[PDB]
């Protein structure tokens, strides 16, 4: 060891890292799904298919 | 953080662990009163946690690897040079006194944090309530200026008011002659230069200013040099105290929660130790401060926050 | 200005007619600038807590980028919608009021006399 | 007295620790490579190839063209008896004056 | 020769009740 | 690569140069349509510039 | 304070402002202001010293007087219109009284005389609530009554606020009074464009709330309330000097920062309405705000004031304070000008 | 113009990811590569400007200022790396980042197609310059110099903001290419008088105009060497660039609005040059000479003839190189004697002969020795002002006496006479310093071979 006291960020908060990566992955797949739904709705409303 | 308002909401009340043996006890006495064992003796009979008296390198012990930092990074002050030259030009006297006051403030914050987090009482040696008795004993010897006493009083007025006093103050009666005898038997070549008038002023501000004002806000105990040798009599006197004074009695979970949120935020504790009062004994110029700060950052385990240093072997930094 | 337009359908961030519009691309340079703002927020968050700036908490930096791109995409959608509503109202008002917007007879410069100011 | 201040540091001489110094850096390898970078990418690249580039600009702002084109037009109007230049830039037939 | 940085005299101007 | 830092500025040129070319195709409304330079396209030619 | 009680009281502050924002009846407007004042009084007395009680007394007296003038404006509206719809007012006397009451609530000059006192008397978090959240409800009421607001009154209040908030901050060393006179000047800028384009009023309010929240969050993270303690930041946390530098250069409105964004847009809407003298004099008066911002940046970032010895102890402890949204608010308050046409989302 | 903007921005990760001994070499190398790439902007035509996009365009006015701007960054890095050697590494990278950011703001200041984007970049250049002066300046008065540099400029420029938004609301656009064709004549009214003042006074401050020049013999003096190089060589020329863009819209009122300001320069260049006869501070002498040279550019832009604009843009480029070299020479002596007092270190040709040859060359270019482009710009301005009014040759010719008389006095006081006895730290000329002097002087001498590239859009 090095430290006389164990720091609060000596070890990664694996629950928080998992929530971070899962929330980021969910927001990316929801963004891509929203964008595909939007371009499909634009092509349907304006007749470009 | 580990403790916060959310922990206070989710059931962590500090009076669930505040038992009868959760007493903050301070041992006081002159420079070679022999109280340094007595404190530990009380801390090994009541089951309390003993904090040794904070020197220059107390903050060095609590942070980093716990080893003492070089003196330019912590202190910038020498107790031995104070013993050699008390009336020095560079102002080592008041700089040493202000650093020791900030060190005792950090120690008192640590002691209240341990008391309010574990419910175990703490034995201290010369807490912040008994630090001014050195300052006056320097000022009555002409070792420091009146402006240094004014700076100390401003810092103490805005810092000590945010804390609770101890439960027990154990004072040790050792006269100036026996103090000098134990100094000469100690054989420290710097400490043997201490004058009679300085020890007499330490005893005078002990008996005439400190102990009368702590007699209202706690229960002071006073022992001579030989009746302090029997620790069991002291522990018998402690365990049969009928605590009826001091502001510990009107402390609910909310006030002690505010106090615990204070004493775990160390920069908030040390907020007013560096007030912008420009005094030549404590003011460091910009070039020396820049140089010493950039040298402090290059120390191992000191460049980043504690879990974020590869040079001491921290792992998983890319996921923290 | 346009507060009477979005008052019959209140508190709608993107109305249904906004779906008639082409949405911003994922390679929209405005959206890439908002992602850069997320990356800068990640670097400042490492700097203020004294972490290594580029290395520490890549999951946190990536959530910063993801959150700014996620909010900024809908903000750009609403931006394009409000300018589309602005121009639609403008063109419908010009069409419904021809007497206020006549076609100006454009004269060529053979008729148009301009006063010559000599620089000497 | 006055506060705790570091004294004025003396000025360093780069020639003491390195008499071959080019004055870029106190490390001699860094100093010599900074010299080579400045001299190559400044003189060998920007000055020489830059003056070569500027020397062979493809008719910078079409001046040479305008000479040669003028050599057409004069040859067209010395031959056809026309004046070398009209005082009117535009045809007076295609101009409406404001009447008075 | 080194850069000027503010002294106590400069800094006490910014430390009164008013400017 | 041991000297990957020496391609940050050059590729940042080339990519930037690329975008300028990509910009020019968005400003091609009058390509071969100006009154000064309009003409008929040569065989095996689809645009007059890029 | 009990943290549950703190949460319920802050939710009641938010509830009062939201009730002002969503209601269609003037009595519920007045009720939202009463609930807002009643709940924000314990936030100002959080530390229980005589300056907080003096500040809360001054705040109570000014907001109570404004609430009574607001109810008199409402009651005169009921006289001359027989109804209660939160819309334009149907009497110039009720319009004047409501504009005066909202100027007292916002602390616009010459009703500004409570703002640098009260902000000085209270902590930094309660000063942040007072200078950001307490603007939202009166600016909403001013947003909804602008077909009845007198032009001469609103522009008099605007220019008097901008000039007095410019000259007031030049004499200060306390940071909270600097932010309070900055508040007075920025509320002048918001109300000067209200009758011309209230979307730019909302833009200026949002950019101001972002920049003020950034500066109060920096002052809380460094525990500095004075200029001369803010000047110790370089020896404690050198990144915070960079952040206060870029945020104070933003609040002065220097391009290419985002605080140039509102005032420029305000000028962009005041010259369309054939007012040239007024936004020019406003822009020249904002140089005073930028002057004392530059004074703070010279004290903090661009020079190094002398520090003390005990600072060396604080080098061994990292900041445990929750610096909530500080990188986000720092990025938004500086690098948002290339996204200036996002403002159409406020239409 | 994005092929120059993106390399300038990639200089930021190039300097923030370099090794601690490598941040000068890498930035110098790649900024010299950007400066080599800058010559592609010489695709100019006799009729049409090089119009890249809706946002960026470059005629033959912006092009030499762009080449000079992109060339000045490596020279500033060479000039500034010695006195920042003991500087902290992160503050060193912040200094380099401010110079990179200033180059970035300038190269899209000069190519701004639309005028409010020109204004945003034009005023965005204040913040890195302010930070460089007030953070890496040497003396106490850098803070006051930063205040003067900020607050003359903003007091000038905020009426310019109001006036440009007025042009936007009236003409419908602030595209310069549109305003070449939709420009309406500006008649005589008081409204158009203050329109003219609001469009001109910001650039009058930035040139600087005499009487408004007071920020400059502080801001050029209290700055570090890279700050003085970019202030003298580029940042004064934003005023002349903006005047040449904005006086299109200000006709024909300019023909009687120019009369006071022309006087303010035609007398002012007599005054400041005379002031250079009695300057004890060498760096202040170079500052007042910069005011004296830019007064001719002010006259040449206000009289708005083709010879005047050609001489004005030639004199802007020539003065950029000359004043940048003069400040670098003054710094090369300040790094030895640690005082800017000109009478202190004398007789330096006995001690530093090649550096005294550089002093001679920069003095000869300062006094407009033919066929240098200093004399080309000087001469064309004198021709156009003689055609303006024949009497002005007096104030021209008298100027050309005094311009010689301080240029050689600066050469005689510093380099000639007996050397000072008690000064003994006069090191030989470093290779970096002579490289800096040559990278100023050799382009300034090669441009006499082909001066047509620095003669503006109406060569
Ligand atoms: C980027 C811009 C924002 C960066 C913020 C963070 C910077 C930082 O922390 O730097 C430290 C860090 C290195 O530090 P370190 O060694 O790890 O540890 C900290 C040190 O110990 C530091 O040592 P120290 O702190 O102990 O002491 C030294 C001291 C030194 O400081 C002092 O002594 C005080 C200050 C000196 C005087 C002031 C100088 C100028 C500083 C302020 C800038 C003002 C001008 C800004 C613009 C004008 C408007 C005001 O402080 C520092 O150096 C602190 C570090 C920060 C320096 C840089 C500050 C940047 C933020 C402000 C500018 C940007 C935002 C506003 C922009 C406004 C509009 C343009 O720098 C970098 O890593 C820089 C980044 C390089 C890699 C870039 C990679 C890019 C990748 C792109 C692709 C992936 C993303 C895709 C996005 C799109 C998705 C769709
Ligand atoms: C829509 C408007 C959104 C407004 C902001 C909402 C959040 C802030 C307000 C509440 C608050 O303070 O929360 C703390 C706040 C973080 O602030 P902080 O404590 O100052 O950050 C320091 C570190 O993040 C502390 O790191 P840590 O070690 O404690 O743990 C890492 C942490 C872990 O994160 C998590 O655990 C999150 C996943 C669990 C969430 C709850 C699930 C149940 O990661 C983060 O929080 C990454 C920061 C992400 C960016 C935060 C701001 C989001 C964007 C706001 C709008 C920007 C618009 C730009 C437009 C520009 C052009 C106009 O937010 C979070 O912790 C969650 C962020 C989730 C973002 C979702 C965005 C899309 C929503 C739909
Ligand atoms: C594109 C290809 C172009 C090729 C041709 C080059 C065109 C001009 C380029 C630049 C020329 C000057 C560079 C050398 C002088 C500067 C350094 C110095 O002093 O070194 C002394 C040193 C010799 O002295 P030393 O004994 O070793 O030590 C010096 C002592 O410490 C102390 O020494 P000191 O004080 O006893 O002696 C210094 C003395 C001082 O001499 C004077 O003060 C007398 C000069 C002024 C009065 C007389 C001339 C007046 C004007 C008439 C001439 C121009 C027009 C002529 C045409 C007919 C009429 C139209 O300097 C000279 O005599 C130099 C002769 C040439 C002078 C040129 C005019 C400079 C005067 C100021 C500006 C005048 C208006 C602009 C004219 C621009 C013409 C293009 O020279 C060298 O070692 C030479 C170094 C390498 C030179 C490279 C030249 C080219 C640079 C560009 C590179 C990229 C393009 C590739 C071209 C490569 C060509 C090979
Ligand atoms: C430019 C704006 C920013 C300013 C700063 C720029 C700094 C960055 C530098 C980038 C690279 C350099 C750019 C500018 C280059 C200028 C030089 C250049 O290109 O010149 C082209 C000029 C072009 O001349 P030209 O126009 O006649 O060329 C004819 C055109 N072609 C070749 C296509 C047919 O080149 C020459 O003149 C070369 C001729 C031979 C070399 C010169 C010989 C005579 C010179 C004097 C010798 C001594 C005589 C006696 C003296 C006695 C002692 C005093
Ligand atoms: C560096 C310090 C000095 C800086 C000097 C800056 C320039 C000096 C003059 C600026 C005047 C103010 C901006 C004018 C903008 C003109 C735009 C326009 O369309 O004008 C026509 C408009 C005309 O109105 P209109 O165009 O809407 O009307 C239609 C047209 N007519 C008139 C025919 C019906 O002018 C105005 O409305 C007023 C112009 C004058 C404004 C007078 C107030 C300011 C006085 C000078 C202040 C100078 C700086 C003060 C600070 C000094 C340092 C602290
Ligand atoms: C971050 C933004 C998150 C937005 C979440 C959705 C909120 C919502 O639905 O808001 C509705 C509102 C549009 O409603 P509208 O009736 O047009 O408002 C009139 C205001 N004068 O939508 C908006 O007003 C959107 C813009 C709000 C931006 C606030 C922060 C800047
Ligand atoms: C058209 C617009 C409609 C409305 C849109 C939304 C408007 C939002 C306006 C935001 C107003 C924020 C008001 C302040 C926060 C309120 C809660 C609070 O009091 O937080 C402070 C809190 C107190 O903790 P304490 O321990 O007392 O701290 C003192 C030290 N012991 O904790 C602390 O001290 C922690 C330190 C950091 C606190 C930072 C808080 C920042 C909040 C503002 C974010 C920016 C605004 C949102 C984005 C833009 C929206 C327009
Ligand atoms: C100190 C530092 C150095 C100086 C820096 C620059 C500061 C000054 C900048 C402005 C200089 C003066 C303005 C330019 C004058 C150009 C010609 C002009 O307008 O002359 C004044 C005017 C002449 O009369 P006239 O031409 O008939 O005006 C009627 C117009 N329809 O005369 C009159 O009508 C009489 C006077 C009327 C009052 C004019 C006040 C406004 C102009 C000055 C401000
Ligand atoms: N002003 C002071 N003068 C002398 N000693 C001091 C002072 N302040 C704190 N001390 C400490 O108090 C110790 C004496 O207590 P003891 O632990 O009994 O030796 C000394 O050795 C010092 O470390």
DSSP chain D: ---B-PPPPPPP-HHHH-TT--SS-SSHHHHHHHHHHHIIIIIIIIIHHHHHHHHT-SSGGGHHHHHHHHHHHHHHHHHS---SS-S-SS-GGG-PPPP-
Please name which of H193, H261, H202 lies closest in space to residue H235, comparing C-alpha atoms.
Answer: H202
Residue D51, number of CB atoms within 10 A of its CB: 17
Chain E residues with CB inside 8 Å of G224's CB? none
**Which ligand is closest to the CA of H190, given by its number?**
8
| Chains G and E contact (Cβ–Cβ under 8 Å for 3 or more pairs) | yes
Which one of C49, C50, C59 has the shortest CB-CB distance to B319? C59
Chain H residue with minimal CA distance to G271? H166
Query: Is residue H29 less than 8 Å (CB to CB) from chain D?
Result: yes
What ligand 1 atom has the least distance to the C-alpha of B294? 26
Whether residue C104 lies inside any domain: the answer is: no
Report d(CA H229, CA H328) in Å as an integer. Answer: 8
Whether residue C91 lies inside any domain: the answer is: yes
CB C41 within 8 A of CB C68: yes
Give strand pairing partners of H1.
none
Contact assignment for E5 to B287 by CB distance below 8 Å: yes
How many CA atoms within 13 Å lie on the side-chain side of H419?
13
- Chain F closest CA to H457's CA: distance in Å? 22
**Which sequence spans correspond to the domains of chain H?**
1-459
> Mapped to the 3 state alphabet, what secondary structure does chain B carry?
CCCCHHHHHCCCCCCCCCCCCCCCEEEEECCCCCHHHHHHHHHCCCCCEECCCCCCCHHHHHCCCCCCCCCCCCCCCCHHHHHHCCCCCCCHHHHHHHHHHHHHHHHHHHHHHHHHHHCCCEEEECCHHHCHHHHHHHHCCCCCCHHHHHHHHHHHHHHHHHCCCCCEEEEECCCHHHHHHHHHHHCCCCHHHCCHHHHHHHHHHHHHHHHHHHHHHCEEEEECCCCCCCHHHHHHHHHCCCCCCCCCCCCCHHHHHHHHHHHCCHHHHCCCCCCCCCCCCCEECHHHHHHHHHHHHCCCCCCCCCCCCHHHCCCCHHHC
Q: How far is the CA of H312 from the centre of ligand 5 (A)?
A: 28
Q: Which of D96, D98, D99 to mutate to test the interface with C (most CBs of C within 10 A)?
A: D96
CB B261 within 8 A of CB G308: no
- Chain A closest CA to B309's CA: distance in Å? 10
Whether residue C81 lies inside any domain: the answer is: yes
Could you tell which of D52, D54, D56 is best to mutate to test the pocket of ligand 4, judged by most ligand atoms within 8 Å of the CB? D54
Q: Which domain holds residue F6?
A: 1-50
| Chains E and F contact (Cβ–Cβ under 8 Å for 3 or more pairs) | no
CB B116 within 8 A of CB B259: yes
Whether residue C114 lies inside any domain: the answer is: no
Whether residue C27 lies inside any domain: the answer is: yes
Report d(CA H434, CA B2) in Å as an integer. Answer: 61
Tokens 């690329």 belong to F18
Experimental method: cryo-EM
According to DSSP, residue H231 is labeled I
Report d(CA H77, CA H38) in Å as an integer. Answer: 18
Number of domains, chain C: 1
Taking the alpha carbons at both ends of chain D, their separation in whole angstroms is 93
Q: How far is the CA of A46 from the centre of ligand 5 (A)?
A: 49
Report d(CA H244, CA H304) in Å as an integer. Answer: 9
Report d(CA D15, CA D38) in Å as an integer. Answer: 20
Report d(CA G182, CA G204) in Å as an integer. Answer: 13
Give strand pairing partners of B284.
D4, G307
CB A19 within 8 A of CB B319: no
Report d(CA H414, CA H341) in Å as an integer. Answer: 10
The token duo for A1 is: 């060891």
Contact assignment for B63 to A4 by CB distance below 8 Å: yes
Q: Which domain holds residue C70?
A: 1-97
Chain H residue with minimal CA distance to E7? H140
Please name which of H436, H444, H334, H440 lies closest in space to residue H78, comparing C-alpha atoms.
Answer: H436
Number of domains, chain F: 1
Which residues, 6 or more positions from H233, have their beta carbon under 8 angstroms from its beta carbon? H68, H72, H319, H320, H321, H323, H324
Whether residue C51 lies inside any domain: the answer is: yes
Radius of gyration for the alpha carbons in chain F, expressed in angstroms and rounded: 17
Q: Give the three-state DSSP class for G47.
A: coil
Report d(CA G248, CA G292) in Å as an integer. Answer: 9
Which residues, 6 or more positions from B226, have their beta carbon under 8 angstroms from its beta carbon? none
- CB of H133 within 6 A of ligand 4: the answer is no
Report d(CA B263, CA B297) in Å as an integer. Answer: 25
Whether residue C37 lies inside any domain: the answer is: yes
Tokens 């080194």 belong to E2
Which one of G171, G227, G306 has the shortest CB-CB distance to E8? G306
Look at strands G307-308 and B283-284 and give their pairing.
antiparallel
Q: Is the N-terminal amide bond of H410 cis, ω within 30° of 0?
A: no
- CB of A34 within 6 A of ligand 2: the answer is no
The subunits that touch chain F, with at least 3 C-beta pairs less than 8 Å apart, are H
Which residues of C lie inside 8 Å of B (Cβ-Cβ)?
Answer: 49-52, 55-59
What ligand 4 atom has the least distance to the C-alpha of H39? 10
| Chains A and F contact (Cβ–Cβ under 8 Å for 3 or more pairs) | no
- Chain D closest CA to B44's CA: distance in Å? 44
Contact assignment for D30 to H21 by CB distance below 8 Å: yes
Chain H residue with minimal CA distance to G303? H135
Report d(CA G180, CA G203) in Å as an integer. Answer: 20
CB H374 within 8 A of CB H318: yes
- CB of H260 within 6 A of ligand 8: the answer is yes
Tokens 């202001």 belong to G33
Report d(CA B307, CA A5) in Å as an integer. Answer: 11
Q: How far is the CA of G155 from the centre of ligand 6 (A)?
A: 28
Helix extents (H) in H108-141:
115-124, 126-136
Please name which of B287, G304, E2, B290 lies closest in space to residue H138, comparing C-alpha atoms.
Answer: E2
Show me where chain D is broken: residue before each gap, C-N > 2.5 A. none
Tokens 């690249």 belong to D45
Chain B residues with CB inside 8 Å of C55's CB? 317-318
Chain H residues with CB inside 8 Å of E4's CB? 138-140, 142
Length of chain D as a residue count: 100
Report d(CA H433, CA G99) in Å as an integer. Answer: 67
- For chain E, positions 1-19, list CB contacts with chain G under 8 A: 5-8, 10-11, 14-19
Residue H454, number of CB atoms within 10 A of its CB: 25
Contact assignment for B282 to G310 by CB distance below 8 Å: yes
- Chain B closest CA to E5's CA: distance in Å? 6
Q: Which of D21, D23, D25 to mutate to test the interface with H (most CBs of H within 10 A)?
A: D23
Query: Is residue A41 less than 8 Å (CB to CB) from chain C?
Result: yes
Q: Whose CA is nearest to atom 37 of ligand 2?
A: A20
Which residues, 6 or more positions from H419, have their beta carbon under 8 angstroms from its beta carbon? H346, H347, H348, H350, H351
Q: Give the three-state DSSP class for G335.
A: coil
**Which ligand is closest to the CA of G125, given by its number?**
7
Residue H51, number of CB atoms within 10 A of its CB: 13
- Chain H closest CA to E17's CA: distance in Å? 23
According to DSSP, residue H416 is labeled S
How many CA atoms within 13 Å lie on the side-chain side of H161?
30
What ligand 5 atom has the least distance to the C-alpha of H159? 13
CB G44 within 8 A of CB G32: no
| Chains C and E contact (Cβ–Cβ under 8 Å for 3 or more pairs) | no
Whether residue C20 lies inside any domain: the answer is: yes
CB G113 within 8 A of CB G168: no
At CA G270, angle to CA H186 and CA H252, rounded to 5?
Answer: 5
What ligand 6 atom has the least distance to the C-alpha of G202? 21
């Amino acid at each position: 060891k090095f430290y006389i006291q164990e720091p609060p960020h000596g070890s990664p908060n694996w629950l928080k890292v998992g929530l971070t990566l899962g929330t980021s992955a969910f927001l990316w797949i929801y963004l891509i799904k929203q964008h595909n739904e939007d371009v499909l709705e634009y092509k349907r409303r304006n007749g470009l298919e | 953080l580990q403790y916060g308002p959310l922990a206070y909401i989710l059931g962590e009340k500090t009076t669930k662990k505040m038992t009868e043996n959760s007493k903050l006890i301070t041992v006081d006495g002159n420079i070679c009163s022999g109280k340094s064992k007595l404190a530990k003796e009380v801390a090994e009979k009541l089951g309390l946690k003993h904090f040794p008296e904070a020197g220059i390198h107390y903050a060095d012990s609590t942070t980093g690897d716990g080893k003492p930092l070089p003196v330019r990074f912590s202190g910038n002050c020498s107790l031995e040079k104070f013993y050699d030259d008390p009336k020095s030009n560079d102002g080592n006297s008041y700089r040493l006194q202000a650093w020791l006051y900030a060190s005792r403030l950090l120690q008192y914050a640590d002691a209240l944090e341990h008391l309010l987090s574990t419910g175990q009482g703490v034995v201290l040696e010369r807490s912040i309530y008994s630090d001014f008795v050195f300052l006056e004993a320097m000022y009555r010897q002409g070792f420091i200026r009146k402006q240094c006493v004014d700076h100390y009083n401003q810092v103490k007025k805005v810092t000590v008011c945010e804390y609770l006093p101890p439960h027990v103050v154990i004072y040790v009666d050792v006269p100036v002659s026996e103090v000098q005898s134990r100094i000469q038997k100690k054989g420290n070549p710097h400490e043997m230069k201490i004058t009679s008038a300085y020890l007499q002023d330490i005893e005078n501000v002990y008996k005439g200013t400190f102990l009368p004002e702590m007699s209202e806000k706690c229960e002071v105990l006073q022992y001579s040099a030989w009746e302090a040798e029997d620790a069991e009599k002291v522990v018998e006197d402690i365990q049969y105290l009928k605590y009826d004074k001091g502001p510990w009695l009107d402390q609910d979970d909310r006030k002690l929660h505010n106090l615990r949120m204070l004493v775990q935020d160390k920069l908030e504790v040390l907020n007013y130790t560096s007030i912008p009062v420009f005094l030549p004994e404590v003011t460091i110029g910009a070039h020396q401060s820049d140089r010493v700060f950039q040298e402090f950052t290059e120390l191992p385990g000191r460049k980043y926050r504690a879990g974020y240093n590869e040079d001491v072997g921290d792992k998983w930094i890319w996921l923290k | 200005m346009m507060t009477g337009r979005q008052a019959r359908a209140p508190l709608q961030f993107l109305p249904d007619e906004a779906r008639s519009l082409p949405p911003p691309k994922l390679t929209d340079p405005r959206l890439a600038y908002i992602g850069f703002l997320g990356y800068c927020s990640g670097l400042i968050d490492n700097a203020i807590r004294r972490r290594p700036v580029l290395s520490a908490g890549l999951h946190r930096q990536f959530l910063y980028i993801t959150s700014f791109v996620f909010v900024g995409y809908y903000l750009l959608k609403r931006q394009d919608y409000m300018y589309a509503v602005r121009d639609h109202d403008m063109f419908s008002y010009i069409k419904s009021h021809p007497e206020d917007f006549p076609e100006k007879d454009k004269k060529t410069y053979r008729e148009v006399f301009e006063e010559f100011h000599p620089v000497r | 007295l006055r506060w705790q201040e570091d004294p004025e540091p003396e000025d360093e001489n780069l020639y003491e620790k390195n008499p071959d110094s080019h004055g870029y850096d106190k490390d001699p390898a860094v100093d010599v490579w900074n010299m080579r970078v400045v001299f190559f990418f400044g003189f060998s690249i920007v000055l020489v190839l830059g003056s070569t580039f500027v020397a062979y600009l493809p008719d910078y702002r079409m001046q040479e063209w305008a000479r040669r084109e003028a050599e057409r037009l004069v040859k067209y109007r010395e031959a056809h008896g026309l004046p070398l230049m009209e005082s009117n830039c535009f045809d007076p037939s295609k101009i409406q004056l404001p009447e008075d | 020769a080194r850069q000027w940085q503010p002294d106590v005299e400069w800094a006490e101007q910014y430390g009164g009740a008013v400017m | 690569r041991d000297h990957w830092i020496h391609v940050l500025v050059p590729v940042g040129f080339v990519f930037g140069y690329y975008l300028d070319r990509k910009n020019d195709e968005k400003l091609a409304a009058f390509r071969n349509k100006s009154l000064l330079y309009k003409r008929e396209l040569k065989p095996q030619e689809e645009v007059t510039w890029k | 304070m009990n943290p549950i009680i703190l949460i319920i009281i802050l939710m009641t502050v938010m509830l009062g402002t939201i009730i002002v924002m969503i209601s269609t009846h003037w009595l519920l407007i007045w009720i939202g202001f009463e609930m807002n004042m009643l709940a924000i009084i314990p936030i100002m007395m959080k530390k229980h010293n005589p300056r907080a009680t003096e500040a809360s007394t001054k705040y109570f007296l000014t907001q109570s007087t404004a609430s009574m003038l607001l109810m008199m404006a409402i009651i005169i509206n009921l006289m001359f219109s027989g109804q209660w719809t939160v819309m334009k007012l149907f009497n110039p006397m009720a319009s004047m009284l409501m504009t005066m009451a909202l100027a007292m609530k916002l602390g616009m000059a010459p009703f500004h005389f409570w703002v640098p006192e009260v902000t000085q008397g209270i902590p930094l978090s309660s000063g942040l609530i007072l200078l950001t959240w307490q603007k939202l409800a009166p600016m909403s009421v001013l947003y909804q009554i602008l077909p009845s607001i007198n032009l001469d009154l609103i522009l008099t209040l605007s220019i008097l606020s901008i000039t007095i908030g410019g000259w007031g901050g030049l004499n200060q060393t306390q940071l909270r009074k600097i932010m309070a006179y900055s508040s007075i000047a920025h509320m002048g800028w918001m109300t000067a464009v209200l009758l011309y384009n209230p979307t730019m009023t909302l833009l200026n309010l949002i950019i101001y709330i972002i920049m003020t929240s950034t500066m109060f969050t920096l002052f809380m993270a460094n525990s500095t309330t004075t200029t001369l303690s803010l000047s110790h930041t370089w020896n404690k946390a050198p990144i915070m000097t960079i952040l206060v530098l870029i945020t104070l250069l933003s609040m002065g409105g220097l391009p290419p920062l985002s605080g140039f964004m509102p005032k420029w847009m305000i000028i962009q809407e005041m010259t369309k309405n054939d007012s040239i003298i007024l936004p020019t004099l406003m822009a020249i008066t904002a140089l005073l705000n930028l002057y004392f911002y530059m004074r703070l940046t010279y004290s903090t970032a661009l020079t190094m004031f002398p520090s003390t010895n005990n600072m060396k102890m604080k080098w061994q402890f990292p900041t445990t304070k929750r610096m909530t949204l500080l990188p986000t608010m720092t990025v938004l308050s500086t690098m948002l000008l290339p996204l200036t046409p996002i403002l159409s989302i406020l239409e | 113009m994005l092929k120059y903007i993106i390399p300038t921005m990639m200089l930021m990760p190039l300097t923030w990811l370099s090794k601690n001994s490598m941040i000068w070499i890498n930035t110098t190398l790649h900024s010299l590569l950007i400066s080599l790439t800058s010559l592609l902007l010489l695709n100019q035509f006799g009729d049409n400007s090089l119009n890249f996009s809706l946002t960026f365009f470059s005629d033959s006015l912006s092009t030499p200022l762009l080449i000079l701007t992109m060339w000045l960054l490596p020279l500033m890095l060479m000039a500034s790396q010695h006195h920042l050697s003991k500087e902290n590494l992160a503050r060193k990278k912040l200094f380099i980042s401010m110079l990179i950011l200033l180059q970035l703001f300038l190269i899209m200041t000069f190519t701004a197609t639309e005028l409010i984007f020109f204004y945003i970049m034009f005023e965005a250049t204040l913040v890195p310059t302010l930070i460089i002066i007030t953070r890496w300046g040497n003396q106490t008065e850098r803070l006051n110099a930063g205040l003067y540099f900020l607050f003359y400029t903003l007091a000038g420029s905020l009426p310019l903001l109001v006036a440009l938004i007025y042009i936007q609301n009236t003409m419908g656009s602030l595209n310069f290419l549109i305003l070449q064709y939709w420009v309406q004549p500006m008649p005589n009214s008081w409204s158009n008088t203050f329109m003219w003042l609001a469009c001109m006074m910001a650039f009058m401050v930035k040139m600087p105009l005499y009487g408004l020049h007071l920020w400059l013999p502080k801001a050029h003096v209290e700055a570090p060497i890279a700050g003085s190089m970019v202030l003298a060589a580029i940042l004064l020329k934003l005023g002349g660039y903006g005047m040449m863009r904005i006086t299109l819209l200000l006709n024909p009122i300019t023909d009687f609005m120019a009369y006071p300001f022309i006087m303010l320069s035609l007398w002012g260049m007599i005054m400041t040059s005379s002031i250079c006869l009695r300057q004890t501070d060498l760096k202040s002498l170079i500052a007042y000479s910069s005011v004296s040279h830019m007064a001719l550019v002010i006259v040449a832009i206000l009289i708005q003839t083709p010879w005047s604009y050609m001489g004005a843009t030639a004199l802007m480029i020539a003065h950029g190189l000359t004043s940048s070299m003069l400040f670098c020479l003054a710094n090369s002596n300040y790094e030895r004697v640690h005082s800017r007092t000109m009478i202190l270190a004398r007789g330096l040709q006995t001690l530093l002969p090649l550096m005294a040859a550089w002093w001679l060359l920069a003095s000869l270019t300062n006094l407009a020795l033919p066929p240098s482009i200093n004399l080309i710009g000087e001469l064309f301005v004198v021709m156009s002002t003689f055609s303006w009014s024949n009497i002005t040759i007096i104030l021209m010719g008298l100027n050309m006496v005094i311009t010689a008389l301080y240029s050689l006095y600066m050469l005689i006081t510093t380099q000639r006479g007996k050397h000072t006895h008690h000064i003994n730290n006069i090191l030989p000329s470093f290779t970096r310093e002579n490289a800096l002097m040559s990278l100023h002087m050799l382009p300034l001498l090669l441009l006499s071979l082909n001066p047509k590239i620095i003669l503006g859009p109406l060569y």
